[PDB]
């Protein structure tokens, strides 16, 4: 329920798209939380990107060390945020198009359900349907 | 003049402009002080929307519960920032258009004065003539 | 009045910040009526930069060679825009800071002025006051 | 069915945010099919706005004409679009919370159903329920 | 060499950035030159993206049904542009990790090299060191 | 090694690009260690520009009223960030073009060399010949 997260920043005005695609795979086998990328624009007529790394508290040498090899950064900054996180649990739920597995998000009187990306893209792959169609599928079977 | 906000964020992939619309009406009508989106990416190719809530501090439990109930999120993080506000009353000028309550911040020897930008679209709208055209008269009104 | 204006474009998601100031500032050197950034997010989860360049019909083989020069792209794209221009004179107005160009635009019923950047950031400068100051005396000094 | 549609653009790099959510007001108002903006980089490290409009081809004079008169830009460019449209109807379908409109997209072998915004909307705040449970209601009304 | 090709533009205010990965992912596999997201922002307060798909002319109904199937827009605008493209040819040099394709650009009196992103990404994987240390070896190999 | 850095943020909906510029230059002018500018999206459908300053903690005074004098807001917020900075420093190295000064930053096992842009650049306008071979010249030399 209650929880902590580090976040690490790093402005990068002089790293590739390619090589920032490539990092963000690195920082996602590493184990971090979250990664992404926000475009901004730095001094000199720079286009640059940040990059924004979410892990454990305990993971920042890992993950500090993996951006100051990667990357071309000098530094990197780091503060720790409080978070505040729903309880999970998995529903199976049959679909005209197969089983789909469902999170069930729950706070307190708080309940929702998602159905997982990697289910419904892999249905709509198989029998050549569009994404939200198996998806909405989903949503609707998932009713009971 | 010395303040203190809290700041909640949230990822979000999987929910829509339309419904991120939607809960940032949600959002202000709850009193946060603030709230605008960042274009992000993340992973697995998606372009996603950060959702970025200013507050009162005691306002956490609400702004969190109505973030987890509208949005799609899991999980919120969230952090105590400073901040530094200057002083501020109104001024009621008389432009060529009619009357427009003019924003006077003040902070030290800082001064400074903002049009409200209300009474400018209002006026703009009722004699058809352009925002930036009331806008600019009531600065120049203001001159004294 | 009426003209054409060539749009070149290329999307790069092999190129450093660093490299793009240095390009703009090439375009803008050669001619170019103006050259802008955008942020765009490409394959294999990359941050990635669109170039524009907006210029002349006949300057089409020195910019595509500027672009391909200097940047990563292989290719460019282009075509052929319409433009509507307004009608332009200046109005040199006395401030307490010094001269400023006033360019005043029309367009059949519109009239607008603004103030030049150049003239308010260089008074501002060199008499040590806020840009704000310097761009809203000129104002001042318009209504007459 | 097919169309052509009108593409306006302008490059703002002197005008605030307050007047670009006026002149996009004002440009829907005026029968602009869409109106957006895409944050964009420009010289001397400004931070700008394109302005995209677009509108059926008769209105070129109309939005062009209001562009120059609540913008601070001297020109705008333009072209003309095909466009491939698909072929629409609605259907009104009962919810627990009353009847929302399902927009029912077809192009060829496509047939796809999107619950319309402004029904979902108004009855999630009439009957005080998130968006998501009046969308979700009406996926599942229009099973039948 | 010269060419033209086909680009497809959609602005979505009502998909998530979930589906949207999809849609990349099925429009690249179908054959389009390339696809990109664009951070829009739209009527009522909708932080939405604008997909871009270019491709070959003749491809123009595969993509745009790709389009209509896969995203929730009722319509696609496109246009053609023309292209100047480069002459390719390639270098495979022998580096410390293996073999990397090296492209040679050349335009009139340009001439550039890129390291093969694909063989530098696979070699920095397969040697465990930054992709930076396997790219700026094939430089180096590249000098002779 | 070891750091701290305060970070002070604004959103501002109502400041010109052509004056953010012109803050950023006055900034960078003041001490702060970096400054950039984030494309955000407000209510009232105003695109906005959310301003990040990074400086030491004893700045604050200093970055606080520059920024409440030269920009329309009415407040700022600031937090501190952790820093872990790499050691950094020069090294001249002999290319085709000239001494270029590169950049060794070093932490613990971590050794990477990145060319200074300001020599690549000057070079590459002296001689006629792409930023990206100066600076790809540069990586080559420093090799040994
Ligand atoms: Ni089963
Ligand atoms: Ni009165
Ligand atoms: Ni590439
Ligand atoms: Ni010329
Ligand atoms: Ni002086
Ligand atoms: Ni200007
Ligand atoms: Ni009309
Ligand atoms: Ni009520
Ligand atoms: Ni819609
Ligand atoms: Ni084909
Ligand atoms: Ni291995
Ligand atoms: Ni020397």
Wanted: charged share 20%; aromatic share 10%.
């Amino acid at each position: 329920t209650a929880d902590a997260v580090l976040m690490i920043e790093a402005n990068l005005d002089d790293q590739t798209g390619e090589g920032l695609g490539y990092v963000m795979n690195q920082l996602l086998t590493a184990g971090a939380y979250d990664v992404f990328f926000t475009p901004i624009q730095m001094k000199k007529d720079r286009p640059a990107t940040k990059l924004t790394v979410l892990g454990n508290v305990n993971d920042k040498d890992l993950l500090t060390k993996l951006i100051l090899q990667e990357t071309t950064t000098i530094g990197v900054r780091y503060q720790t945020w409080q978070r505040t996180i729903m309880q999970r649990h998995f529903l199976t739920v049959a679909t005209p198009y197969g089983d789909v597995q469902v999170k069930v998000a729950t706070y307190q009187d708080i309940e929702k359900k998602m159905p997982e990306y990697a289910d419904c893209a892999q249905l709509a792959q198989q029998f050549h349907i569009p994404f939200r169609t198996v998806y909405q599928a989903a949503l609707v079977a998932v009713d009971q």
